[PDB]
Tab-separated table of C-alpha atoms (C1' of nucleotides) in Angstrom:
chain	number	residue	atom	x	y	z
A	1	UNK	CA	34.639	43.908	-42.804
A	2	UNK	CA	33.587	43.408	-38.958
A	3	UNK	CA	37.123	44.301	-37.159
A	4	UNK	CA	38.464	40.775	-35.725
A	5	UNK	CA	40.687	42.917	-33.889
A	6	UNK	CA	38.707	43.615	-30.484
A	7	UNK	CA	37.502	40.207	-28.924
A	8	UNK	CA	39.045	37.147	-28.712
A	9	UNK	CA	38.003	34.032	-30.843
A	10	UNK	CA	35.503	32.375	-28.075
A	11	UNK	CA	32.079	30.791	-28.891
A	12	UNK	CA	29.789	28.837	-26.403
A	13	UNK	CA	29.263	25.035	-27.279
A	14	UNK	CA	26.733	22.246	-25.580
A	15	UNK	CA	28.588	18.938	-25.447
A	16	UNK	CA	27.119	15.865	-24.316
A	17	UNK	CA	28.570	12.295	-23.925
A	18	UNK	CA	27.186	9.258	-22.413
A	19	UNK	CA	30.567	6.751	-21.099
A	20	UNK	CA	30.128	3.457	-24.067
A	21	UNK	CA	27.452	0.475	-24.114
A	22	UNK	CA	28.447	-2.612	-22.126
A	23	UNK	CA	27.101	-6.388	-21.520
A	24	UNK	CA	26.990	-5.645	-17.931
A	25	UNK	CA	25.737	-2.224	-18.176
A	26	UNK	CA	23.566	-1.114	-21.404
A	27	UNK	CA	22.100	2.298	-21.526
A	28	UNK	CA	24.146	4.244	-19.286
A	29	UNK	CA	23.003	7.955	-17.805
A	30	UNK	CA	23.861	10.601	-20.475
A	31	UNK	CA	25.825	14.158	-19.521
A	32	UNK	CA	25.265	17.143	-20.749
A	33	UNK	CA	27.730	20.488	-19.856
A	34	UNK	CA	27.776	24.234	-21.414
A	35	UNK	CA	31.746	24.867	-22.286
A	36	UNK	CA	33.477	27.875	-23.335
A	37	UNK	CA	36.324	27.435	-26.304
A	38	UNK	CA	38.121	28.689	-29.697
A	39	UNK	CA	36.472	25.918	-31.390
A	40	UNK	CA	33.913	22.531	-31.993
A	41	UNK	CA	36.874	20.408	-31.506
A	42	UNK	CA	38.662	22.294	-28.710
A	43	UNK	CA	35.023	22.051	-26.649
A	44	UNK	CA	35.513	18.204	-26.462
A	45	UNK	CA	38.726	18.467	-25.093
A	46	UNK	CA	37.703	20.542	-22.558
A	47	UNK	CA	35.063	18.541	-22.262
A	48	UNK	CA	36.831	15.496	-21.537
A	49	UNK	CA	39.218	16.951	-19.081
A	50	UNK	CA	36.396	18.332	-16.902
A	51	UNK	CA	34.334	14.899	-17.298
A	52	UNK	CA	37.232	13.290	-15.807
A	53	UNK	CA	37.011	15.662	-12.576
A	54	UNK	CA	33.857	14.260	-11.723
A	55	UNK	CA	32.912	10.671	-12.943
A	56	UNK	CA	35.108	7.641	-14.081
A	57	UNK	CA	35.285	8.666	-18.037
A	58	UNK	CA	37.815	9.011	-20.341
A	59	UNK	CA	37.840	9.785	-23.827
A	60	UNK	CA	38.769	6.186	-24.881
A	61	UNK	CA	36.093	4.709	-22.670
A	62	UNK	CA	33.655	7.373	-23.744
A	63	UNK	CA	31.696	8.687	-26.999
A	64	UNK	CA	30.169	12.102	-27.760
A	65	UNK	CA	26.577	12.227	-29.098
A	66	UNK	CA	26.443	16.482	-29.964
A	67	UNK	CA	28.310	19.515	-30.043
A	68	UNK	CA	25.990	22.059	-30.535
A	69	UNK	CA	26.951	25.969	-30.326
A	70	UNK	CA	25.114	28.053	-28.581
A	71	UNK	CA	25.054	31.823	-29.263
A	72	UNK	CA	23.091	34.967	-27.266
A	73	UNK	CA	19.580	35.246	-27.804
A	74	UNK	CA	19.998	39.312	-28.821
A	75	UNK	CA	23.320	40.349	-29.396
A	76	UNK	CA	22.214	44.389	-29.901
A	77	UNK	CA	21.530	45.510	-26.414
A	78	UNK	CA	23.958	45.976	-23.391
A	79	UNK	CA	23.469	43.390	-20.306
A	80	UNK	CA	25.018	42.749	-16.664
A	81	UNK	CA	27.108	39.389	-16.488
A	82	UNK	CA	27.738	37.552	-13.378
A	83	UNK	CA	31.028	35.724	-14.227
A	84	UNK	CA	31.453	32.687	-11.824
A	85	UNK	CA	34.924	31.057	-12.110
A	86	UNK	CA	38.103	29.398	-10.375
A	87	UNK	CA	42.342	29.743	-11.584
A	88	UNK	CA	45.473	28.387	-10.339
A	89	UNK	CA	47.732	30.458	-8.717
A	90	UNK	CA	51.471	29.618	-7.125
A	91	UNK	CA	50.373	28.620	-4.212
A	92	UNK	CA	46.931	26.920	-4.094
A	93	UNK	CA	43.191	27.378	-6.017
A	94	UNK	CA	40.961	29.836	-5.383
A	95	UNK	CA	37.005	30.712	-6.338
A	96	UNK	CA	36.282	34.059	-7.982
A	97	UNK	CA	33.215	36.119	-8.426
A	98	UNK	CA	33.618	38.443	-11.293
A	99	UNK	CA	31.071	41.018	-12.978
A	100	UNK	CA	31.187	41.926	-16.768
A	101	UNK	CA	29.578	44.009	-18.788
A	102	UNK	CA	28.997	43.641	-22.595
A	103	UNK	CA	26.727	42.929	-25.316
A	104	UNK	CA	27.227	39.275	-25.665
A	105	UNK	CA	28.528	36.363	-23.337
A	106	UNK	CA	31.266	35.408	-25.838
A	107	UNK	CA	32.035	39.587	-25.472
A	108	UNK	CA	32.145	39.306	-21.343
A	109	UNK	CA	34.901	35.425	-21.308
A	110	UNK	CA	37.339	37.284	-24.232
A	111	UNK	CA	36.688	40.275	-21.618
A	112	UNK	CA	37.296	38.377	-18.472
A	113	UNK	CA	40.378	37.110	-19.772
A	114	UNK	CA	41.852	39.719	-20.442
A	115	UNK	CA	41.093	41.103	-16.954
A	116	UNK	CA	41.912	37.520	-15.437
A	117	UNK	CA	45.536	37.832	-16.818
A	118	UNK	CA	46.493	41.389	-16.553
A	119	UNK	CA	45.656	41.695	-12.541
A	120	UNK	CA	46.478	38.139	-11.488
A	121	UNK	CA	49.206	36.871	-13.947
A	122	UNK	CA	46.750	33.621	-14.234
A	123	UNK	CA	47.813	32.005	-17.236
A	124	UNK	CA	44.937	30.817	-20.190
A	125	UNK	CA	45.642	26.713	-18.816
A	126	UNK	CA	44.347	27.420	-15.157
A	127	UNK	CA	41.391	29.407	-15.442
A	128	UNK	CA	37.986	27.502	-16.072
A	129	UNK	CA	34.699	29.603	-16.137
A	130	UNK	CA	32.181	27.842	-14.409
A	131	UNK	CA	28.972	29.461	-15.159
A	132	UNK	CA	28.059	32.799	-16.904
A	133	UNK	CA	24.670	33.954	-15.932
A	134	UNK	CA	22.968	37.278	-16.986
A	135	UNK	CA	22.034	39.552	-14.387
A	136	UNK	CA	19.792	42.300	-13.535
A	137	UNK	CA	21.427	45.500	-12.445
A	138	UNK	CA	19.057	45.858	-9.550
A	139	UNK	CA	21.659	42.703	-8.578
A	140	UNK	CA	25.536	43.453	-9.388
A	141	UNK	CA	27.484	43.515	-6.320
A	142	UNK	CA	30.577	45.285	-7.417
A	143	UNK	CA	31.192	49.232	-6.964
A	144	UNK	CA	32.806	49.623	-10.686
A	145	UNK	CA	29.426	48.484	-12.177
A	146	UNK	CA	27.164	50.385	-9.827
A	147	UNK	CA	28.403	54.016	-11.017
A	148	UNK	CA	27.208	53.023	-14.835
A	149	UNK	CA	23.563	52.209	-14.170
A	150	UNK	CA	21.418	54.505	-14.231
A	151	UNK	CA	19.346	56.520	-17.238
A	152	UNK	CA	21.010	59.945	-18.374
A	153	UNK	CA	24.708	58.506	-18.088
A	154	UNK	CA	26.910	60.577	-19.364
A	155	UNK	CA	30.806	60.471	-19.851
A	156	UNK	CA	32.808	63.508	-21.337
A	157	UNK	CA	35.864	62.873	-23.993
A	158	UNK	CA	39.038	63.699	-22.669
A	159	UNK	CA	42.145	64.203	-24.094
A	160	UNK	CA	41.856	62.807	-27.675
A	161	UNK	CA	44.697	60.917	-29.333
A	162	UNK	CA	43.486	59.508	-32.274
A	163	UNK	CA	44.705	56.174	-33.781
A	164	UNK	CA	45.124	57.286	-37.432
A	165	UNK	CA	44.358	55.210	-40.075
A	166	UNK	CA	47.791	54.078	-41.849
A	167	UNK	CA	48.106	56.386	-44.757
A	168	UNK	CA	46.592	58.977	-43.181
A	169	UNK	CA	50.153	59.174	-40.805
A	170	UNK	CA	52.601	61.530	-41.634
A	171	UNK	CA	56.561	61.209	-39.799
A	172	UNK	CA	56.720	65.499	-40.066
A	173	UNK	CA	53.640	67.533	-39.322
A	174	UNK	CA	53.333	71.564	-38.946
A	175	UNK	CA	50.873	73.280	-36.680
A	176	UNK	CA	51.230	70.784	-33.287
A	177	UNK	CA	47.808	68.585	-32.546
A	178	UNK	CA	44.964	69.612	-30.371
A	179	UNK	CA	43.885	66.987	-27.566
A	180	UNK	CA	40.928	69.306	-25.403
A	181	UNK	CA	39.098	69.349	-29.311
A	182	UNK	CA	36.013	70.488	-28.292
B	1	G	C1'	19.495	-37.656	-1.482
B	2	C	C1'	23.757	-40.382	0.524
B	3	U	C1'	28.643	-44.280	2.312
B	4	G	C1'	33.418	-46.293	0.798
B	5	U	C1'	38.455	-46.821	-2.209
B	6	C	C1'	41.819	-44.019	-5.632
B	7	G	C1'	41.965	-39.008	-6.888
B	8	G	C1'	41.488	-33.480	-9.248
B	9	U	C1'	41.253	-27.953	-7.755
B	10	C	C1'	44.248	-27.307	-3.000
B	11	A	C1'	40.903	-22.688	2.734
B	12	U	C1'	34.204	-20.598	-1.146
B	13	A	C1'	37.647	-26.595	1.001
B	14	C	C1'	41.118	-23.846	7.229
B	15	U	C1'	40.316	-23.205	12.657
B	16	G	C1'	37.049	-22.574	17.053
B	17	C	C1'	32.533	-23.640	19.563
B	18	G	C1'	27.412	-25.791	19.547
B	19	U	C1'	23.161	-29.122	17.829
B	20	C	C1'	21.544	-33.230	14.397
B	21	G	C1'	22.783	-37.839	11.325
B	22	A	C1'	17.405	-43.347	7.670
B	23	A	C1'	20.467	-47.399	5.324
B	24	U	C1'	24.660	-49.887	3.923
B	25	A	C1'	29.751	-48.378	5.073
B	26	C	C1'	34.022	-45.990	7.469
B	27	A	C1'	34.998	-46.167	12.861
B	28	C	C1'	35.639	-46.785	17.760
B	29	C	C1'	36.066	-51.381	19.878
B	30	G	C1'	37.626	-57.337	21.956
B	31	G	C1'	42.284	-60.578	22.046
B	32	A	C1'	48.020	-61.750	22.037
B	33	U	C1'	48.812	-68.434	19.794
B	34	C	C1'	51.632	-67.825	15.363
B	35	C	C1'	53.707	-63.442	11.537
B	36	C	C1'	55.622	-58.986	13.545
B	37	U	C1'	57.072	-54.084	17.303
B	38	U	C1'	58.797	-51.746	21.315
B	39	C	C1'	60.458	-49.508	28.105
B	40	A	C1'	55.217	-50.460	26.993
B	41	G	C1'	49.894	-55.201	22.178
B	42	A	C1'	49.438	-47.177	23.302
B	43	C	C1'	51.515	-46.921	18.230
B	44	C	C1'	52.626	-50.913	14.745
B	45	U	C1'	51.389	-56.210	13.394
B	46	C	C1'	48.504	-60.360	13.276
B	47	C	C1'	43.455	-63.187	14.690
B	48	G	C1'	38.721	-61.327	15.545
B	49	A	C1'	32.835	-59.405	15.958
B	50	A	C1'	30.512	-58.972	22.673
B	51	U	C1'	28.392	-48.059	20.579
B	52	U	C1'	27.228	-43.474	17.617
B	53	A	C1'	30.392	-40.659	22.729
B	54	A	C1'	34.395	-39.015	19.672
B	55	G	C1'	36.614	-39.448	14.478
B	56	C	C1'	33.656	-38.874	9.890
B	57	G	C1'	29.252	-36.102	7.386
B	58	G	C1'	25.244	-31.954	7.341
B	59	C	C1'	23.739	-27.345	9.525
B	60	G	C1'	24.113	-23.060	12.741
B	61	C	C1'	27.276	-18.620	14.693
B	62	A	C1'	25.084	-10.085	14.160
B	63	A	C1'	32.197	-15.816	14.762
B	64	G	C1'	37.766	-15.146	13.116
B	65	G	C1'	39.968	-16.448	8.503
B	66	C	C1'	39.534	-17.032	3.486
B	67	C	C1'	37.236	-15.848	-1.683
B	68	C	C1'	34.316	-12.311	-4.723
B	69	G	C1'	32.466	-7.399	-5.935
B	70	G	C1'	31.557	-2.033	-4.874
B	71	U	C1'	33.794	2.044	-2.895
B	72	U	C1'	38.615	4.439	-2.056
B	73	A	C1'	39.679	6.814	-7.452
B	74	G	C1'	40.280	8.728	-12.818
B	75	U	C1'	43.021	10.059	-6.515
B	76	A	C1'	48.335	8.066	-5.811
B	77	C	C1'	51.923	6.894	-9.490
B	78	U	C1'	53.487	7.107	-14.618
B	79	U	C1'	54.887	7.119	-20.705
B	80	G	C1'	55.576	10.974	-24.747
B	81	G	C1'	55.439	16.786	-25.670
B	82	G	C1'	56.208	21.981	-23.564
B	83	U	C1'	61.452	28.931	-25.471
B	84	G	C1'	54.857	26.013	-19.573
B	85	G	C1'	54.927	28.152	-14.231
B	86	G	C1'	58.744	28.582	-10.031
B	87	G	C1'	64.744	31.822	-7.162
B	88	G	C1'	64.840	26.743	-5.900
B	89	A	C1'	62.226	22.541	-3.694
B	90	C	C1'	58.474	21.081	-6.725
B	91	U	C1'	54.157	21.724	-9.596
B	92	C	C1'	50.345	22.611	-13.960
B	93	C	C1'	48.496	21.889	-19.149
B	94	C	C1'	48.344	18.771	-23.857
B	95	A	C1'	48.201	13.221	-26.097
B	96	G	C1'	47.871	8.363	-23.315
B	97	G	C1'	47.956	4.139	-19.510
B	98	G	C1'	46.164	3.735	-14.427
B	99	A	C1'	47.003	1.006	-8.828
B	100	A	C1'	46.733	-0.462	-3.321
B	101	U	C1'	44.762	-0.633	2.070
B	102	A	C1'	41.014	1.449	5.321
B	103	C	C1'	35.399	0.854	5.398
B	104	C	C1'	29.859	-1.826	4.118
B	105	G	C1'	27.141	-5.626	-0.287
B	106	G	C1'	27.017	-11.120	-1.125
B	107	G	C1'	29.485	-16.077	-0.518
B	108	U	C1'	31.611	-20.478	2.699
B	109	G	C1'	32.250	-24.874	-2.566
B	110	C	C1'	32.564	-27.422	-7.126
B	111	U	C1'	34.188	-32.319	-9.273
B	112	G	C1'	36.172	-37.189	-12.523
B	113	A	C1'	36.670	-42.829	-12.240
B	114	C	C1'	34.816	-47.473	-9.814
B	115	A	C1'	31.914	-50.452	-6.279
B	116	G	C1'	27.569	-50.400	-3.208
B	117	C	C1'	22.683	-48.021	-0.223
B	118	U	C1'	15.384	-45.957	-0.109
RNA sequence: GCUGUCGGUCAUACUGCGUCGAAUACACCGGAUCCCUUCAGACCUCCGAAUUAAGCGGCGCAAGGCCCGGUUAGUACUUGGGUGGGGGACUCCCAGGGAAUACCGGGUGCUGACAGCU
């Protein structure tokens, strides 16, 4: 009944692996990392791939303890996201500060990709969000969030073209529609 | 703890320079009649018994070398997959394997058979 139409299929997980006991080296130093993904599976991939970035792991000479998802604390009300995050263009890398605004933090990285894609043609493989942190709006640096805040917002409905429900559609209609409604 | 003869691994065992070695013992060392060797008793050979300086052994050196580990680095490179990216040159993701100098933390030996010596 809730429309799976709107976001993409993201959910926050916790992973955390710990490299693999040896004789020379018993207990080793534990890792812990917040991931973004489709899925509990897809998270230890990712996982695996950024673990590799930074420390001599791999998922042969590793082993994963958890994979615990992590949701929002309250999901009803509307909060400022500062998105924090680097992609792969033709030429080289580059470091991105983007700001998001929606309910939930899964809501804001199906957002950002969207947004990520359409302006920079940076492909799903490339991008990796580094850390999504919620902000207050006494605190957003970007002009397109600035004009929102504020109490007594208002925002008038123009030019209204409905998506009718299928049924409701007709091929032939008489009277010709009415966008200004009012 | 050592010295000799025959060795094993064949530099952790080599090379350079400097100090110290109880006791056998290796050694320098004295001689040319015979065995024997040359230009030459230096080498070699034979017959000997009136100083640890070298050889030999131990240790040192902000030593060179050598050996071992950590970095370098999950980088370079690479196997399988892609109706991935890119005009090409090339490059990224997925499932896997994965080096080498440079440079600093420790080392400089271990050993079998036989005969002897604090």
């Amino acid at each position: 009944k809730a429309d799976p139409t709107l976001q993409q299929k993201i959910s926050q997980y916790q992973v955390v692996g710990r490299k693999q006991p040896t004789e020379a080296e018993p207990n080793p130093s534990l890792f812990r990392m917040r991931l973004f993904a489709r899925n509990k599976v897809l998270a230890v991939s990712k996982f695996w791939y950024l673990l590799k970035k930074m420390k001599k792991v791999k998922k042969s000479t590793g082993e994963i303890l958890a994979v615990n998802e992590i949701r929002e604390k309250r999901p009803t009300f509307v909060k400022n996201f500062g998105v924090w995050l680097r992609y792969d263009s033709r030429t080289g890398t580059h470091n991105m500060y983007k700001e998001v605004r929606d309910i939930s933090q899964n809501g804001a990285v199906s957002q950002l990709y969207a947004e990520m894609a359409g302006r920079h043609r940076a492909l799903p493989s490339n991008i990796q969000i580094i850390r999504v942190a919620e902000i207050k709006a006494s605190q957003c640096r970007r002009a397109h969030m600035q004009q929102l805040f504020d109490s007594k917002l208002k925002l008038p409905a123009i030019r209204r073209i409905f998506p009718t429900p299928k049924d409701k559609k007709s091929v032939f209609c008489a009277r010709k529609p009415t966008l200004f409604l009012h």
